[PDB]
Amino acid sequence: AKDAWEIPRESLRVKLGQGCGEVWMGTWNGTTRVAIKTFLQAQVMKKLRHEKLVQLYAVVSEPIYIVTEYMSKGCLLDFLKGEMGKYLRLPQLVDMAAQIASGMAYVERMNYVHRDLRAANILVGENLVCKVADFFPIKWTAPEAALYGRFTIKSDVWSFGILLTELTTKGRVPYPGMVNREVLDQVERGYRMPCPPECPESLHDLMCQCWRKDPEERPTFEYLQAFLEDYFTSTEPQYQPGENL
Numbered sequence: 001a002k003d004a005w006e007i008p009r010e011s012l013r014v015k016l017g018q019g020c021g022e023v024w025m026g027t028w029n030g031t032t033r034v035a036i037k038t039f040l041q042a043q044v045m046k047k048l049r050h051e052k053l054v055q056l057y058a059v060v061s062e063p064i065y066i067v068t069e070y071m072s073k074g075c076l077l078d079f080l081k082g083e084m085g086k087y088l089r090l091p092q093l094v095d096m097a098a099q100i101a102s103g104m105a106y107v108e109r110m111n112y113v114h115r116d117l118r119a120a121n122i123l124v125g126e127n128l129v130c131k132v133a134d135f136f137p138i139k140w141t142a143p144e145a146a147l148y149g150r151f152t153i154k155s156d157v158w159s160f161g162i163l164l165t166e167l168t169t170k171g172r173v174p175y176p177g178m179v180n181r182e183v184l185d186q187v188e189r190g191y192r193m194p195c196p197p198e199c200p201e202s203l204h205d206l207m208c209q210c211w212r213k214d215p216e217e218r219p220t221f222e223y224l225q226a227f228l229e230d231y232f233t234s235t236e237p238q239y240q241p242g243e244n245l
């Protein structure tokens with residue numbers, strides 16, 4: 001018993017592959033360029049709609065397909081590690097952070113929880129447009145949630161702070177040189193990544209706020225969004241560009 005998102009398989013006509021089934025670029029009803037990911041229960045993608053979340057377009061539930069808006073620049077992790085990462089500077093990265101926070105503030109208002117917020121699950125479009133996608137790996141996960149299964153918007157905040165380090169290192173894997181068990185144990189004892197090179201202290205302070213032991217003391221996404229948007233006026237107005245950031 002299909003809902004109004006259903007389209008016919010025949011409605012769908014170049015690989016980008018990978019992932020636990022594939023990601024093709026395709027054409028929809030001969031006119032519309034889309035992404036197709038070749039479970040279900042996408043039921044969540046139908047109920048969320050915001051300009052910083054990747055948009056559902058259609059599903060085939062028969063040979064399954066999930067169809068979405070096309071994000072030309074691929075995932076944010078590949079984007080950052082690619083050619084165009086040596087040119088990114090703080091302003092572009094802080095702005096990308098802002099669009100992510102904003103997508104997440106929406107998710108926060110809708111009372112949902114992401115659970116896998118990390119640069120690999122963000123898609124990037126034209127004009128440095130970033131949208132939250134792909135609905136657990138311990139380096140990105142809050143303690144209370146890697147250990148005891150307590151996933152909340154507050155654990156998403158934690159991941160956000162880790163994503164912040166992904167943005168400021170141009171996509172380096174966090175806790176560099178540390179292994180899952182060493183990260184678990186060092187974080188338990190109160191360790192936190194230090195300020196990334198060239199990164200202003202105030203942005204590192206923001207990461208540490210995101211990484212508080214007590215979830216409830218972690219900031220909201222509305223707070224993170226607003227702080228990021230206003231960063232270069234309210235927080236770092238004497239920012240001078242550098243060799244990497």
Ligand SMILES: */C=C\C(=O)Nc1ccc2ncnc(Nc3cccc(Br)c3)c2c1
Nearest residue numbers: 023035037066074075076077078120134
């Ligand atoms: C970091 C690699 C990567 O995931 N890239 C990527 C590029 C484009 C794209 N378009 C559409 N969908 C996805 N991924 C995806 C993953 C899980 C579920 C779904 Br419906 C889509 C990508 C991924």
